[PDB]
UniProtKB/Swiss-Prot annotation:
HAMAP family: KduI (MF_00687). The lineage of its organism: Bacteria, Bacillati, Bacillota, Bacilli, Lactobacillales. The gene is kduI1. Coiled coil: none annotated. Zn(2+) binds at E196, H238. This is 4-deoxy-L-threo-5-hexosulose-uronate ketol-isomerase 1. Catalyzes the isomerization of 5-dehydro-4-deoxy-D-glucuronate to 3-deoxy-D-glycero-2,5-hexodiulosonate. The keyword Transmembrane helix does not apply.
Length: 255
């Protein structure tokens, strides 16, 4: 099955007295990669639809049209993808390529069918997709960790020794507004310091991250587990501290 939960946005005031529960209910996505299905969430923050399509025993395709007042999913949207799990395949309008972990892809407006598949149901490919409205059509371009020069910064003295990877960025491809990145916190570090959406993964079962959010003067946090995502509205902070090491994919769009 496939599924897309929509989430309205709020104002720093609406959230001012939110309970830990409420916060989680509005800004935390607990299940991103549920095997055999596509799990998506539509945020009214710039209308980004993100989530995870993790195929196992049957190739998957995000089929959306009436829900978005269009004939097919990408008629008026661009989409970024990065495989977080096992080796798989991506079939964009017939052309079937290989998607190994860390392999990404920028697909543009008007591509009819994008189908995802894994080469092993036991170790499925976890495709994290970030879809956003697009008015212009740019060429589809495959992205491989290789071709990317990870712009590292931070220092283990400030527990932020990390490597950032620009996937959907001007240095590797064109796009209307989507922007994606892959960041891996080097061991012994655990920090992260127009709307954004974060997905944390590749972390020990017991490590958890304290994702900070809200207006800088009224910050609150979401306690997150492995493979969970957080929606961060324009007016909110984007940093987070982990109990240990972790990686995360950030997707954004705006102006």
């Amino acid at each position: 099955l496939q599924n897309m939960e929509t989430r309205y946005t709020h104002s720093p005031a609406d959230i001012r007295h939110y309970s830990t529960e409420q916060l989680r209910d509005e800004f935390l996505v607990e299940k991103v990669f549920i095997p055999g299905a596509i799990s998506l969430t539509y945020t009214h923050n710039d209308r980004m639809i993100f989530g995870g399509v993790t195929p196992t025993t049957e190739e998957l395709e995000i089929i959306l049209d009436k829900e978005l007042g269009v004939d097919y999913f990408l008629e008026r949207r661009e989409l970024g993808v990065i495989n977080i799990g096992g080796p798989g395949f991506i079939e964009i309008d017939g052309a079937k390529e290989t998607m190994k972990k860390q392999d990404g892809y920028y697909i543009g407006k008007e591509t009819k069918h994008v189908r995802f598949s894994s080469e092993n149901p036991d170790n499925p490919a976890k495709f994290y997709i970030s879809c956003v409205p697009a008015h212009h059509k740019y060429p589809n371009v495959k992205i491989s960790i290789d071709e990317i020069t990870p712009m590292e910064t931070g220092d283990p003295l400030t527990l932020n020794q990390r490597k950032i990877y620009q996937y959907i960025h001007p240095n590797v491809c064109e796009s209307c507004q989507l922007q994606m990145g892959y960041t891996i916190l080097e061991p012994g570090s655990a920090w992260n310091t127009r709307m954004e959406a974060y997905v944390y993964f590749d972390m020990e079962e017991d490590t958890r991250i304290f994702h900070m959010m809200g207006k800088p003067d009224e910050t609150k946090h979401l306690v997150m587990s492995n493979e969970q995502a957080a929606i961060s509205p324009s007016w909110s902070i984007h940093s987070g501290v982990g109990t240990s090491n972790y990686s995360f994919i950030w997707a954004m769009c705006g102006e």
